Design a protein around this motif. Structure first.
Motif, PDB file in Angstrom:
ATOM      1  N   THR A  29     -41.605   6.916  36.536  1.00  0.00           N
ATOM      2  CA  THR A  29     -42.142   7.192  35.202  1.00  0.00           C
ATOM      3  C   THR A  29     -42.556   8.649  35.005  1.00  0.00           C
ATOM      4  O   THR A  29     -42.999   9.018  33.911  1.00  0.00           O
TER       5      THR A  29
ATOM      6  N   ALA B  74     -39.761   8.451  32.249  1.00  0.00           N
ATOM      7  CA  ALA B  74     -40.535   9.316  31.353  1.00  0.00           C
ATOM      8  C   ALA B  74     -39.741   9.525  30.051  1.00  0.00           C
ATOM      9  O   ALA B  74     -38.754   8.842  29.808  1.00  0.00           O
TER      10      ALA B  74
ATOM     11  N   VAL C  33     -51.586   8.027  24.405  1.00  0.00           N
ATOM     12  CA  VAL C  33     -50.658   8.812  25.201  1.00  0.00           C
ATOM     13  C   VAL C  33     -50.281  10.069  24.425  1.00  0.00           C
ATOM     14  O   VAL C  33     -50.041  10.008  23.219  1.00  0.00           O
TER      15      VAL C  33
ATOM     16  N   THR D 198     -47.198  12.747  24.379  1.00  0.00           N
ATOM     17  CA  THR D 198     -45.844  12.956  24.872  1.00  0.00           C
ATOM     18  C   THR D 198     -45.466  14.441  24.873  1.00  0.00           C
ATOM     19  O   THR D 198     -44.309  14.788  25.134  1.00  0.00           O
TER      20      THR D 198
ATOM     21  N   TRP E 255     -45.971  10.217  30.458  1.00  0.00           N
ATOM     22  CA  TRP E 255     -46.941   9.220  30.045  1.00  0.00           C
ATOM     23  C   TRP E 255     -48.326   9.769  30.377  1.00  0.00           C
ATOM     24  O   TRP E 255     -48.945   9.417  31.386  1.00  0.00           O
TER      25      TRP E 255
ATOM     26  N   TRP F 225     -52.290  10.623  29.645  1.00  0.00           N
ATOM     27  CA  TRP F 225     -53.416   9.908  29.057  1.00  0.00           C
ATOM     28  C   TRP F 225     -54.704  10.517  29.626  1.00  0.00           C
ATOM     29  O   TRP F 225     -54.649  11.396  30.487  1.00  0.00           O
TER      30      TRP F 225
ATOM     31  N   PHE G 285     -46.277   0.230  29.721  1.00  0.00           N
ATOM     32  CA  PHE G 285     -45.746   1.452  29.145  1.00  0.00           C
ATOM     33  C   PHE G 285     -45.187   1.057  27.780  1.00  0.00           C
ATOM     34  O   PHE G 285     -44.089   0.502  27.672  1.00  0.00           O
TER      35      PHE G 285
ATOM     36  N   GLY H 299     -43.610   1.815  24.466  1.00  0.00           N
ATOM     37  CA  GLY H 299     -42.754   2.805  23.838  1.00  0.00           C
ATOM     38  C   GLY H 299     -42.522   2.587  22.353  1.00  0.00           C
ATOM     39  O   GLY H 299     -41.462   2.925  21.825  1.00  0.00           O
TER      40      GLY H 299
ATOM     41  N   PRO I  93     -46.430   5.926  21.216  1.00  0.00           N
ATOM     42  CA  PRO I  93     -46.591   5.274  22.517  1.00  0.00           C
ATOM     43  C   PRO I  93     -48.041   5.159  22.974  1.00  0.00           C
ATOM     44  O   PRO I  93     -48.882   5.997  22.630  1.00  0.00           O
ATOM     45  N   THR I  94     -48.318   4.141  23.787  1.00  0.00           N
ATOM     46  CA  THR I  94     -49.616   3.973  24.415  1.00  0.00           C
ATOM     47  C   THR I  94     -49.407   3.435  25.830  1.00  0.00           C
ATOM     48  O   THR I  94     -48.302   3.029  26.193  1.00  0.00           O
ATOM     49  N   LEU I  95     -50.483   3.449  26.607  1.00  0.00           N
ATOM     50  CA  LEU I  95     -50.509   2.876  27.946  1.00  0.00           C
ATOM     51  C   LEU I  95     -51.568   1.789  28.013  1.00  0.00           C
ATOM     52  O   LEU I  95     -52.673   1.961  27.496  1.00  0.00           O
TER      53      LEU I  95
END
Length: 330
Positions: free
Chosen positions: A36, A129, A188, A190, A195, A197, A317, A319, A323-325
């Motif tokens: 990632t 990624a 996140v 980019t 990724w 954070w 992950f 997408g 995007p967020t985690l």
């Protein structure tokens, strides 16, 4: 669509994890390191300099009826550990755990550096990624996830890495049986292609939680947890005899020690890394000095939540357009 594949440690230390990937027609199965922190899918191949291949399984595009040379395209990559590889590019059909992408850029290595040659268990990398980091020139290529995204039931993949045990990469769905409690999602950036954070802080062992913003990346292709020198010093200060060794290249500790846990914050939630996950064993065979799993990021220029951290969690992950985690305990 969805996919689900098991990922397996390459050795007794969890130095890396390999996941089987089907490439071409008929399928050629290679064991790839899902990463990632990068965005190239590259493989050992029939084009790799023979002296630089030592036990790896190779992709042979001439034996795949769906392989096509991507004319004029080349690639060249360097990783955080100083390793590197380069070559040319084919498109072919790639499947992971039942999920199939047609026309995936498969980057064929002509040259690999010594650490790749020496790792007989890793047949290449599958980058996860953002595609903005892909190194193919003159036409940048998309990652496997980016290509699969529109077909997936949900635009997500998850990493569920095991401690001294296999785990799972899922694409397109969240397995609600794979974690305990709730998933906490966090923003996140980019902007650097990662990724990236911001953790909300840390604790050492049973100590009080320190609220402090720690910007870093979720990187399945990095073994260890790399954090600011302040944080790392606070951790190792709780282990009698631990010290930073310039000759070894980081913190080492007496193999007779019992390591404290390390907690990191995800919003108001907390992920606890057990002490045992931080033990990377003797620095050399028979030594009583052991290598630490938490190391300083000073001079890397970025903090890295590598496998040591990620394997303590179920990690989403996400997408989606923004995007967020997500992190859950498990």
């Amino acid at each position: 669509s969805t996919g689900s594949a098991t990922t397996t440690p390459i050795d007794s230390l969890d130095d890396a994890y390999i996941t089987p990937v089907q490439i071409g027609t008929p399928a050629q199965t290679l064991n790839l390191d899902f990463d990632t922190g990068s965005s190239d899918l590259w493989v050992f191949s029939s084009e790799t300099t023979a002296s630089e291949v030592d036990g790896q399984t190779i992709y042979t595009p001439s034996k795949s009826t769906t392989a096509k040379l991507l004319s004029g395209a080349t690639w060249s990559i360097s990783y955080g550990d100083g390793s590197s590889s380069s070559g040319d590019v084919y498109t072919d059909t790639v499947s992971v755990g039942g999920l199939t992408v047609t026309g995936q850029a498969v980057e064929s290595a002509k040259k690999v550096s010594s650490s790749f040659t020496e790792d007989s268990t890793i047949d290449g990398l599958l980058g996860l990624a953002f595609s903005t980091l892909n190194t193919v020139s003159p036409t940048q290529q998309k990652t496997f996830f980016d290509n699969a995204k529109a077909s997936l039931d949900s635009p997500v993949f998850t990493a569920d890495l095991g401690y001294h045990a296999p785990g799972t990469y899922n694409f397109g769905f969240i397995d609600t049986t794979a974690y305990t409690g709730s998933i906490t999602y966090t923003a996140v950036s980019t902007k650097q292609g990662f990724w990236e954070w911001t953790s909300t802080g840390y604790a050492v062992g049973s100590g009080t939680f320190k609220s402090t913003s720690i910007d870093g990346i979720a990187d399945t292709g990095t073994t260890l947890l790399y954090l600011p020198a302040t944080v790392v010093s606070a951790y190792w200060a709780q282990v009698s005899g631990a010290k930073s060794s310039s000759s070894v290249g980081g913190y080492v500790f007496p193999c007779s020690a019992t390591l404290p846990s390390f907690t990191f914050g995800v919003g108001s939630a907390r992920i606890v890394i057990p002490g045992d996950y931080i033990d990377f064993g003797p620095i050399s065979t028979g030594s009583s000095s052991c290598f630490g799993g938490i190391q300083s990021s000073a001079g890397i220029g970025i903090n890295i939540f590598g496998d040591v951290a990620l394997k303590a969690a179920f990690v989403v992950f996400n997408g989606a357009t923004t995007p967020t985690l997500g992190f859950a305990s498990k």
